[PDB]
């Protein structure tokens, strides 16, 4: 799904599988958060569904000891004095000791501030304990979390329910055409990107000898040359677009371990899971009612949330009893207008455009020499056209799919390509789509704030600030305090300060609120990047103060106030909105739940081989399931004919569904349903 999708998935703690437990065997004790999980396994990251608590992620700083247990780092305190010496402890070993919390105030030498400090003890119990009894203390405030979890800014401001979803959803982010790093970070975005392996890291130090869109060559110091080839437009396991681009220019001095070229969802070696959007926290003509989302058309005209999706289409030619399947450009009863996009072999030409129903790989098979219809025999004597013994078995484009053919892979038994027993020619056509963002596409932030796109207004309709700039995204106010995830609010505040830039007042000294603020943040440029590490980083007092520090725009005017709000103009009526609206920048990710995949329908199609009912799934072009629960709703209404129809002529009535299709196309009345073939099956199974 993304450089993080892999990462998260490469390290998972599942209690499922052989030797372990089944899903129905697991009670309520196995699933919930245990005290020993601290710094070893995350308490946040776990699935929502029936697998909840049985699947988790490994905490960041943890590691596995030679016996299969989970160790975790702690700093060693000799006697009230912190020592840089670190020892890894196991679960039961820690219980015998006593551990201090990471954020406890420490002397510049290494000593504690207060005699009594916050203390972790066996069995998840906590108490104040004198400084003489302190054995160890935590490595980091963010020690207990996982990799994806630590990437959630202001985590300690969102409830575990939505913060859970905030971690899970990042996994389903989609790689966009090009990706931007978030204005608000946590610092984890770097190490995650590097350790993903889906970026290009320089092995040995040196200088870029040559750079192209194809590959990067590095001249080392000893003389040897290593060349790094770029993955260009490759299809991932999930049809997303793994595409790498060179960061460095030719002649740059590059050291070892440095990212010289990143991949999808990466901007300058950092996890770029989304875009920085100009948000507005308000109801707007109801189009964002119940967690729906309104977008600026700017995100469609500038491809800000546009993605590339690649599909692999396959088909083969086998040896049959009536001869052998051959891949040819000659398909029975097809015009030259349909075949126009093929080459001489029967394969589509690279770069060609394909819609649904069109032909990708023309294949025909020898059909059984069964007596052709006497009514079709008669029809072949009039027009004197002799029937061919080859039936159309071509690879056509599935319903919904469309795009540009971006490559062909052909494997022939003839060209010594080693194939399975029975196969002659195998063709792989690869088709990519350039899906812009549309209605129904699921977007989300890092704080469990999900939802689908309700409406995308034209750029002018958008509620805009005083200087004319239209907001990008309009989130509804109602669905914020309920979810307790007001970290999305803090992200909006800090997000605005980061876009405008700021400068604390140094005249009359350094202010008291910005006294804990490190020197480097007392002055910031427009479009600056910052870090808010979990259980550290920004506090509400500094954020409020920074909102006062907001640098004016190009016209010399400040746009938001100390509250973080600003005055908007309704792009439709023109009049200014009566009250100040909270405006800022938020990081929004494109999730992999797109309507272009989700949508599906069916009149008639394939049917079950035994029950003679419709098949199931979009892949098999099957119809929906009208379950036991839905048959109660019908029964309650008292809609007998609707209910009967659904389970008879709409389902597995062999002779009915055919005579319904005919009654419709002739414009007559729907006939009377017969006997459900499934019921015939039951009476035979009983026998």
């Amino acid at each position: 799904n993304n450089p993080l999708s892999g990462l998260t998935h490469k390290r998972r703690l599942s209690a499922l599988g052989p030797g372990g437990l089944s899903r129905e065997r697991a009670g309520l004790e196995v699933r919930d958060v245990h005290p020993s999980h601290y710094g070893r396994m995350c308490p946040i990251e776990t699935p929502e569904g029936p697998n909840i608590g049985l699947i988790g992620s490994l905490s960041v700083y943890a590691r596995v000891n030679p016996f299969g247990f989970i160790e975790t780092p702690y700093r060693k305190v000799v006697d009230g004095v912190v020592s840089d010496e670190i020892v890894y402890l196991t679960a039961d070993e820690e219980d015998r000791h006593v551990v201090a919390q990471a954020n406890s105030p420490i002397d510049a030498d290494g000593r504690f501030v207060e005699p009594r400090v916050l203390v972790r003890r066996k069995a998840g119990e906590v108490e104040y304990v004198p400084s003489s009894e302190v054995d160890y203390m935590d490595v980091s405030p963010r020690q207990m979390v996982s990799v994806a979890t630590a990437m959630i800014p202001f985590l300690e401001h969102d409830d575990a329910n939505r913060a859970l979803m905030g971690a899970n959803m990042q996994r389903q982010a989609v790689p966009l055409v090009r990706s931007e790093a978030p204005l608000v970070g946590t610092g984890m975005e770097l190490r995650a990107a590097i350790d993903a392996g889906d970026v290009v890291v320089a092995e040995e130090s040196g200088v870029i000898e040559e750079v192209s869109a194809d590959y990067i060559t590095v001249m080392h110091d000893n003389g040897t040359r290593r060349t790094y080839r770029m993955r260009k437009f490759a299809r991932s396991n999930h049809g997303t677009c793994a595409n790498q681009c060179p960061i460095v220019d030719a002649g740059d001095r590059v050291e070892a371990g440095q990212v010289i070229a990143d991949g999808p969802c990466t901007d300058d070696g950092e996890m770029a899971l989304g875009k920085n959007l100009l948000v507005a926290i308000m109801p707007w003509e109801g189009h964002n009612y119940e967690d729906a989302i309104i977008l600026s058309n700017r995100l469609v005209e500038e491809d800000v949330l546009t993605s590339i999706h690649i599909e692999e289409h396959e088909i083969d030619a086998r040896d049959t009893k009536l001869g052998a399947e051959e891949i040819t450009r000659d398909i029975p009863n097809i015009s030259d207008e349909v075949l126009a996009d093929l080459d001489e072999r029967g394969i589509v030409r690279i770069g060609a455009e394909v819609r649904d129903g069109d032909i990708l790989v023309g294949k025909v098979t020898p059909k059984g020499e069964t007596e052709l219809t006497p009514e079709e025999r008669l029809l072949r004597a009039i027009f004197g056209e002799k029937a061919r013994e080859v039936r159309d078995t071509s690879l056509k484009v599935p319903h919904g799919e469309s795009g540009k053919v971006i490559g062909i892979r052909v494997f022939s038994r003839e060209d010594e390509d080693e194939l399975p027993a029975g196969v002659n020619e195998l063709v792989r056509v690869y088709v990519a789509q350039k899906r812009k963002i549309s209605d129904g596409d699921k977007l989300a932030g890092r704080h469990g704030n999900k939802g689908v796109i309700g409406k995308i207004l034209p750029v002018e309709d958008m509620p805009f600030l005083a200087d004319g700039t239209p907001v990008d995204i309009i989130l509804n106010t109602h669905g914020v305090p309920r979810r307790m995830n007001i970290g999305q609010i803090l992200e909006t505040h800090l997000g605005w300060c980061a876009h405008s830039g700021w400068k604390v007042d140094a005249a009359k000294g350094v202010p008291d609120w910005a006294a804990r603020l490190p020197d480097e943040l007392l002055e910031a440029q427009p479009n600056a990047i910052v870090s808010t590490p979990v259980f550290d980083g920004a506090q509400e007092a500094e954020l409020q103060g920074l909102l006062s520090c907001t640098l004016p725009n190009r016209d010399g005017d400040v746009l938001v106030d100390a509250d973080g709000k600003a005055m908007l103009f309704d792009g439709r009526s023109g009049e200014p909105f009566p009250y100040p609206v909270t405006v800022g920048y938020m990081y929004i990710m494109k999730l992999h739940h797109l309507v272009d995949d989700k949508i599906h329908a069916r009149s008639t199609g394939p049917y079950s081989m035994i029950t003679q009912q419709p098949l199931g799934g979009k892949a098999q072009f099957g119809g929906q399931r009208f379950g036991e629960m839905e048959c109660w709703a019908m029964q309650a209404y008292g809609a007998a004919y609707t209910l009967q129809e659904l389970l008879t002529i709409k389902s597995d009535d062999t002779v009915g569904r055919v005579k319904v299709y005919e009654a419709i196309v002739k414009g007559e009345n729907i006939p009377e349903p017969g006997i459900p073939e499934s019921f015939k099956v039951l009476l035979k199974e009983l026998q």
Binding site: V60, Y61, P73, R75, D84, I86, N103, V139, S140, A181, G185, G187, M188, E189, L190, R191, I194, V254, E255, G257, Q258, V259, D268, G269, E270, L517, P518, E520, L521, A524, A528, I529, V530, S531, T532, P533, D536, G537, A538, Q539, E542
Partner: peptide
């Protein structure tokens, strides 16, 4: 800065100084 190890973009950090160990 936060991670001044590889040759990365400078991401300034609100923080108590974290020098126990790199991830």
């Amino acid at each position: 800065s936060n991670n001044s190890v590889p040759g990365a973009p400078n991401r300034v950090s609100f923080a108590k100084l974290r020098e126990p160990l790199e991830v």
